[PDB]
């Protein structure tokens, strides 16, 4: 059930139109605007359905994006941080996310995609990148990555829960 998860996610995320880069002040405001509306709609729906897994906010310039994500399994709760910046050229090849919380846990991957799984995401994005933006990126890249890594990293012995670190 991979292709169907992918289809559902795009079937619930509203589609954009503009594909501009931050190079142009005005063009960026337009592109950024559609991206925000699509992402806000997605998180509004997702969080309202008590299905929240990520949180993402950005600077007034929309150049750098940051957020956090939480996952639940075996009655335990975990948290992770994320921070990335958009390339000035914004190419057809998707952007790259970084996770400081896991910087050192996961092995140093090849130079280009330290946590950007490529298995199905790279061919999926390359075959279809009409108007795909950050909402689509996270839900079809960050989402599956976390859903693949949580079970594996737990059984392998890399991650643990943090309740016990406090109360």
């Amino acid at each position: 059930m991979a292709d169907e998860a992918t289809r559902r996610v795009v079937s619930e995320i509203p589609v954009l139109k503009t594909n501009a880069g931050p190079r142009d002040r005005e063009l960026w405001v337009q592109r950024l605007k559609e991206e925000y509306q699509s992402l806000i709609r997605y998180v509004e729906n997702n969080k309202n359905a008590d299905n929240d897994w990520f949180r993402l906010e950005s600077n007034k310039e929309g150049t750098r994006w940051f957020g956090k994500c939480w996952y639940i399994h075996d009655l335990l709760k975990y948290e992770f941080d994320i921070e990335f910046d958009i390339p000035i050229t914004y190419p057809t090849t998707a952007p790259e996310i970084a996770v400081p919380e896991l910087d050192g846990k996961t092995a140093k991957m090849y130079r280009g995609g330290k946590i950007c799984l490529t298995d199905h995401f790279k061919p999926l994005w390359a075959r279809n990148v009409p108007k795909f933006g950050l909402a689509h990126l996270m839900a079809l890249g960050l989402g599956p990555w976390l859903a693949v890594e949580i079970p594996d990293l737990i059984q392998k012995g890399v991650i643990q829960h943090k309740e016990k670190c406090n109360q």
């Binding site: 509203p14 139109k17 605007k33 509306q37 992402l39």
Partner: peptide, 27 residues
């Protein structure tokens, strides 16, 4: 080529500052 059946962004003349403001504020 119209795409009436496909989903479309909630673009109702909102402003960027407002968009990002509700976004960061939503947590």
């Amino acid at each position: 080529g119209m795409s009436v059946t496909e989903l479309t962004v909630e673009d109702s003349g909102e402003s960027l500052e407002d968009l990002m403001a509700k976004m960061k504020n939503m947590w």
